Amino acid sequence: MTNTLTTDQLQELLQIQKEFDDRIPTLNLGDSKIAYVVEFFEWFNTLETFKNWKKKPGKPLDVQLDELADILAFGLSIANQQGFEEYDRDLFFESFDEEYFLDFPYLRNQDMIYDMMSEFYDDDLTSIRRLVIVFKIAEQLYTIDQLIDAYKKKMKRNHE
Amino acid sequence: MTNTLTTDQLQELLQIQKEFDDRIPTLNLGDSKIAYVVEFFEWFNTLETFKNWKKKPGKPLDVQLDELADILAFGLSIANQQGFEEYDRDLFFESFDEEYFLDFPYLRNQDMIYDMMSEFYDDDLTSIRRLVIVFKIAEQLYTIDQLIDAYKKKMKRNHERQDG
Numbered sequence: 001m002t003n004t005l006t007t008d009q010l011q012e013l014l015q016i017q018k019e020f021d022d023r024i025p026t027l028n029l030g031d032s033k034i035a036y037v038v039e040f041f042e043w044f045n046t047l048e049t050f051k052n053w054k055k056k057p058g059k060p061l062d063v064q065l066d067e068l069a070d071i072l073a074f075g076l077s078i079a080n081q082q083g084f085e086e087y088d089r090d091l092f093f094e095s096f097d098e099e100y101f102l103d104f105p106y107l108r109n110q111d112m113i114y115d116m117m118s119e120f121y122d123d124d125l126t127s128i129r130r131l132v133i134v135f136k137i138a139e140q141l142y143t144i145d146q147l148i149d150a151y152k153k154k155m156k157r158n159h160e
Numbered sequence: 161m162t163n164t165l166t167t168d169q170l171q172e173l174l175q176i177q178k179e180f181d182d183r184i185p186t187l188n189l190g191d192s193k194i195a196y197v198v199e200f201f202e203w204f205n206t207l208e209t210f211k212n213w214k215k216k217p218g219k220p221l222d223v224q225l226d227e228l229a230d231i232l233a234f235g236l237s238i239a240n241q242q243g244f245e246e247y248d249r250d251l252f253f254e255s256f257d258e259e260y261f262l263d264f265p266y267l268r269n270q271d272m273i274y275d276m277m278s279e280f281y282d283d284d285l286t287s288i289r290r291l292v293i294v295f296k297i298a299e300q301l302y303t304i305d306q307l308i309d310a311y312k313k314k315m316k317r318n319h320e321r322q323d324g
């Protein structure tokens with residue numbers, strides 16, 4: 001069952017993020033939104049689907065998951081900063097369950113980056129959507145469990 | 161060594177890039193365009209204008225210039241792959257000379273990244289424009305000379321990659 005997300009897991013992740021962000025008095029929503037986008041590209045660079053010049057493209061899994069965990073962190077951070085109640089959690093699991101286009105072949109296509117950019121400059125981009133994106137990448141390319149594991153490791157390192 | 165770019169310097173850069181890209185039989189325009197965008201973000205990440213949580217934000221200058229050089233390389237690559245004649249060179253220097261918005265305060269504002277993204281998703285984005293962007297960053301935040309220096313170093317290293 002290593003590739004499903006429960007409401008308890010999501011709430012624990014939000015709490016872990018909140019306790020870290022509590023240490024950062026400059027915490028700023030505009031910056032965290034920019035940070036999400038930059039981390040997304042850092043992650044996309046580890047995937048290397050556009051790097052036709054590599055003999056063996058793709059950085060190591062742990063490196064890919066570490067970068068994916070940085071996206072989650074800002075996604076969780078934006079969620080907490082905006083306020084993320086039960087109704088928001090409900091809508092997240094409904095959006096996740098109803099997402100049919102963010103699958104493996106789509107996410108492996110280097111051109112997906114343009115679609116993502118379009119969503120990233122849209123000022124209506126929601127905190128729910130940002131989380132759906134990162135969790136669907138985890139579900140389809142990795143597992144949710146591996147993302148959560150990598151996130152917990154990274155957050156411990158971030159605390160030091 | 162003047163923070164200016166001449167037509168001879170630009171033509172040398174294009175020739176350096178062509179000779180490297182000649183070694184890459186999978187050379188692909190869509191991939192190079194994607195690569196330009198990715199390297200732009202790798203470079204923006206070294207600037208750290210959005211990273212309010214850092215005691216001392218901004219990676220070292222050599223790191224920042226190295227990443228800036230990777231953008232130049234794909235910009236030069238896209239130029240050569242599309243064809244870059246005299247008329248293209250003429251129009252580049254006119255665009256560069258006529259660019260008044262891409263200055264230091266604008267480029268230091270984290271929010272510029274959204275403007276850049278909009279330009280990057282536009283399929284009408286030109287090879288000239290991509291070069292204007294990277295050379296204005298060099299001019300305003302660094303010097304053109306430092307970019308060229310960093311690009312030449314990086315291309316030597318890149319030749320050694322394909323060597324082994």
Ligand SMILES: O=c1ccn([C@H]2C[C@H](O)[C@@H](COP(=O)(O)NP(=O)(O)OP(=O)(O)O)O2)c(=O)[nH]1
Binds near residue numbers: 020074211
């Ligand atoms: O407000 C914040 C800021 C940072 N962080 C954490 C999340 C993420 O794991 C990490 C990202 O911070 P940096 O971008 O500064 N370090 P990174 O490991 O990404 O290296 P680089 O900056 O070289 O890409 O810090 C937060 O959780 N909240």
Ligand SMILES: O=c1ccn([C@H]2C[C@H](O)[C@@H](COP(=O)(O)NP(=O)(O)OP(=O)(O)O)O2)c(=O)[nH]1
Binds near residue numbers: 051180192229230
């Ligand atoms: O067609 C090409 C391919 C690569 N290059 C050069 C430009 C740039 O300096 C470098 C980019 O390739 P990589 O992304 O593999 N090197 P980097 O260490 O920057 O990548 P990463 O940080 O993702 O490991 O190789 C070209 O000039 N033309």
Ligand SMILES: [Mg+2]
Binds near residue numbers: 039042205
């Ligand atoms: Mg980072």
Ligand SMILES: [Mg+2]
Binds near residue numbers: 039042066067070
């Ligand atoms: Mg990162």
Ligand SMILES: [Mg+2]
Binds near residue numbers: 045202230
């Ligand atoms: Mg790179």
Ligand SMILES: [Mg+2]
Binds near residue numbers: 226227230
């Ligand atoms: Mg690079």
